[PDB]
Design a protein around this ligand. Structure first.
Ligand SMILES: Cc1ccc(-c2[nH]c3ncccc3c2CCC(=O)N2CCOC[C@H]2c2nc3ccccc3[nH]2)c(-c2ccccc2)c1
Ligand SMILES: [Zn+2]
Length: 219
């Protein structure tokens, strides 16, 4: 008796509680992010960030944008958040210009908020078509200014021509000297680029890149 109505009430309760849970998770993520941003542990430890988790969706969009440029470098902005020593990249958008970059950034955050996901500006990406993942002279100077003004901010470099050719980097501040050596993995770079590479290779380091697939990103 009233078994049918009970089942519909049960389904309604599950749906109403799921909606409340998503809202509480969003609000908890927001406060947590605001707290991490107030503490700024990265301003004291120059090697604080060590990991970079990239969604398949952000990767798909970045590779498509990088491929579309051909032999020309392209760039865009990335959305995500901080989780300890890990920089999370959840989404990205192609560029194109400053006001336009501001208005898209605001639109992507609102769109994610509607589906209960917290994200903000986390970095920039650009392509090195046919010459590997590293920071050039202009990239090192741009990323140093970013780690003073746009902080927390990561520099992603993609080489769409050749395996998973993506690098995530963090510069060292002016005057700071890191300890010992760090050539990491091998990368073949053209001879006409090797000097610019060498002149700036100790002014930054690489984050440990990993990839993830979100439930919302299963599209
Ligand atoms: C703030 C900043 C700092 C450094 C760079 C950058 N890092 C690099 N690493 C290797 C070789 C070069 C670079 C450039 C500069 C590359 C460029 O200047 N261009 C690309 C080819 O096309 C003409 C031109 C360009 N300038 C644009 C301005 C707005 C929109 C598209 C644009 N393309 C960029 C950048 C990167 C890619 C595309 C656009 C800007 C932006
Ligand atoms: Zn570059």
């Amino acid at each position: 008796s009233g078994s049918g109505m009970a089942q519909k009430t049960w389904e309604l309760a599950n749906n109403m509680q799921e909606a409340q849970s998503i809202d509480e998770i969003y609000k908890y993520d927001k406060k947590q992010q605001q707290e991490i941003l107030a503490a700024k542990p990265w301003t004291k430890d120059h090697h604080y960030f060590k990991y970079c988790k990239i969604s398949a969706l952000a990767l798909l969009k970045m590779v498509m944008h990088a491929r579309s440029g051909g032999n020309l470098e392209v760039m865009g902005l990335m959305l995500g958040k901080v989780d300890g020593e890990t920089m999370i990249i959840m989404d990205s958008f192609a560029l194109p210009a400053q006001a336009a970059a501001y208005e898209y950034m605001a639109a992507y955050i609102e769109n994610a908020k509607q589906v209960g996901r917290l994200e903000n500006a986390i970095g920039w990406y650009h392509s090195h078509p046919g010459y590997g993942c590293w920071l050039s002279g202009i990239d090192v100077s741009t990323q140093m200014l970013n780690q003073q003004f746009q902080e927390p901010f990561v520099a992603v470099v993609i080489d769409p021509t050749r395996k998973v050719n993506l690098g995530a980097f963090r510069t060292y501040p002016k005057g700071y000297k890191p300890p010992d050596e760090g050539p990491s993995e091998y990368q073949t770079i053209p001879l006409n680029k090797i000097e610019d590479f060498g002149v700036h290779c100790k002014q930054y380091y690489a984050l440990e890149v990993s990839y993830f697939k979100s439930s919302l990103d299963r599209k």
